[PDB]
Amino acid sequence: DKERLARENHSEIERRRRNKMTAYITELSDMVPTCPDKLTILRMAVSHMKSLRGSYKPSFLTDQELKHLILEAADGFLFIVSCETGRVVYVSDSVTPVLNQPQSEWFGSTLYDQVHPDDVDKLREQLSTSSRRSFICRMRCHFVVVHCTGYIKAWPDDDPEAKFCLVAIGRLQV
Amino acid sequence: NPSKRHRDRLNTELDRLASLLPFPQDVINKLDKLSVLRLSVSYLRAKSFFDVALKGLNLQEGEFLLQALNGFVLVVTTDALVFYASSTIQDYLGFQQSDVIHQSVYELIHTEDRAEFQRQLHWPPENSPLMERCFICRLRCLLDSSGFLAMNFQGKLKYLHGQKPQLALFAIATPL
DNA sequence: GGTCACGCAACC
DNA sequence: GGTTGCGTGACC
Ligand SMILES: [Er+3]
Ligand SMILES: [Er+3]
Ligand SMILES: [Er+3]
Ligand SMILES: [Er+3]
Ligand SMILES: [Er+3]
Ligand SMILES: [Er+3]
Ligand SMILES: [Er+3]
């Protein structure tokens, strides 16, 4: 008949909910234009949020923040190339710290021009198009080992299904 | 009563704030009130840090980055708390980023590898040669797996700012 | 083990 | 009239 004790342990639990609640308010008051009533901190937090910002894609992190992050953890850069004709479609600015010669001899040049001669035949096999492809090749600046991972997406939300393009990122192999 | 109004108008702000979060509605509405705050500050922390460090297809780029990568992105702090887990964590481990962020990283790691990971957190200048981490670890998986899907963290530990000077592991998860 | 909502006693 | 915390219970 000491159930009050176990219901006194219930109090301890509900208490942490407060501390965790309040502790977040304090945390949520350090990422705001201040050093205060909690409610005010929540209204100001809503204000901050709305200041930061058919189908539309929300994101914890923007393209700049992802681009950067990947570029930091792995030395990876994005590129989209045309699935058959060696035609580059896009290359992020992250091709500068990984490799050099950004956005000039990669801008309109064929992806086959940026690889080794002895890798062309091994690359066209990836681009048969006869869903996700990954490989490794040797890239220009003399040469470095690049691991490439990505998927195939076409370039022209349905119920059944959707020239194609290889959308992939390449990072220094290790 | 006046206490009922207190809690009520205190709640409506949590609901608005939650609705402003950058997740699908499916998950927003099932958010625990505490989770709302917790992750809501995780967001602002990430934004601060990125503002200090970073101080038309350019848009499609991010999406392409998440899918093109054979894995997901992870940011952990020395406190061993996921500063960030990319949306694609669901695609390889069956966890929704919503419920991974600001939760002990150790609730995703196998007991055996938990130790090695703890050692990888703590080994220092900004871009030293040291504290480049490339270690293998098994992480819980919820897909049809046998649990504990084995994969390989390749990342570069660097200094974490914007919070208040702690370190942090920024890494990529390579499943193979 | 945990959430959410009560109502209470403080205090500006 | 406000907000800060506390111990309960119902409902999972
Ligand atoms: Er009883
Ligand atoms: Er690097
Ligand atoms: Er050229
Ligand atoms: Er349709
Ligand atoms: Er919870
Ligand atoms: Er975008
Ligand atoms: Er074992």
Instruction: Please count the residues of chain A.
Output: 174
A82 assigned to some structural domain: yes
> Is residue A27 one of the residues assigned to a domain?
yes
Output the domain CATH number for residue A17: 4.10.280.10
Asked if residue A34 and residue A86 are part of one domain, the reply reads no
Q: Are residues A120 and A165 in the same domain?
A: yes
Instruction: Note whether A97 and A153 are same-domain residues.
Output: yes
- Give the number of other Cβ atoms within 10 Å of residue B123's Cβ: 11
Residues A11 and A68 in one domain: no
Of A43, A59, A74, the CB nearest to B62: A59
Quote the ligand 7 centre to B73 CA distance (angstroms).
Answer: 26
Residues A146 and A78 in one domain: yes
A41 and A74 fall within a common domain: no
- Does residue A117 fall inside a structural domain? yes
One domain, residues A68 and A134: yes
The DSSP element (H or E) to which B114 belongs, if any, is helix B111-121
Experiment type: X-ray
Q: Are residues A6 and A46 in the same domain?
A: yes
Provide the total of helices (H) and of strands (E) in chain B, helices listed first: 6, 5
Q: How far is CA A53 from CA A47, B11, B17, B52, in A?
A: 10, 21, 12, 19
Is residue A118 assigned to a domain? yes
Domain of A108, CATH number, reads 3.30.450.20
Q: Which residue precedes each gap in chain A (C to N above 2.5 Å)?
A: 35, 53, 130, 141, 156, 162
- What residues of B are in contact with residue A53 (Cβ under 8 Å)? 20, 22
**Helix (H, G, I), strand (E, B), or coil: what is residue B77?**
strand
In a domain, A20, yes or no: yes
Residue A153 neighbours by CB under 8 Å, 6+ apart: A164, A165, A167
Instruction: Confirm whether A58 is domain-assigned.
Output: no
Which chain B residues are closer than 8 Å to A62 by Cβ?
62
For A68, the domain range is 63-172
Q: Which residues of chain B from 108 to 167 reach within 8 Å of chain A, CB to CB?
A: 134, 154-156, 158, 164
Q: With an 8 Å Cβ cutoff, are B170 and A59 in contact?
A: no
Find residues whose C-beta atom lies within 7 angstroms of strand C.
A 10, 13-14, 16-17; B 1, 3-4, 7, 11, 32-34
Residues B12, B137: Cα–Cα separation, whole Å: 42
Check: CB of residue B142 under 8 Å from CB of residue B94.
yes
As for how many domains chain A has, the answer is 2
The amino acid that residue A62 corresponds to is T
Helices B60-68/A63-73 angle, 10° precision? 40
Are both A122 and A100 inside the same structural domain?
yes
Residue A57 resides in a domain: no
Minimum-distance CB partner of B10 among A39, A45, A48: A39
- The enclosing H or E element of B4 equals helix B2-19
A22 and A72 assigned to the same domain:
no
Q: Which alpha helices (H) appear in A3-97, and where do they start and end?
A: 3-28, 38-52, 63-73
Q: Which nucleotide is nearest to B32 (CA to C1')?
A: C3
Distance CA B171, CA B72 (A): 9
CB contact under 8 A, B9 and A39: yes
Of B17, B34, B41, nearest to A31 by CB-CB distance is B41
Which ligand is in closest contact with the Cα of B138?
7
Q: Are residues A140 and A96 in the same domain?
A: yes
Question: CB A63 to CB B59 under 8 A?
Answer: yes
Would residue A148 count as lying in a domain?
yes
Q: Residue A18, CB, less than 7 Å from strand D?
A: yes
From chain A, pick out residues whose CB is under 8 angstroms from the CB of B66: 66
How close, in Å, is residue A155 to chain B by CA atoms?
Answer: 12
Centroid of chain to Cα B23: 13
Measured to protein CB atoms, the chain D nucleotides within 7 Å are: 1-10
* Token representation of residue A27: 């945390």
Which residues, other chains included, contact A93 with Cβ-Cβ below 8 Å and sequence gap of 6+?
A67, A102, A103
**CA nearest to nucleotide D1 C1': residue:** B2
C-alpha angle A96/A100/A103, rounded to 5°? 65
A86 and A31, same domain (yes or no): no
Instruction: Using the C1' atom of nucleotide D5, identify the protein residue whose alpha carbon is closest.
Output: A18
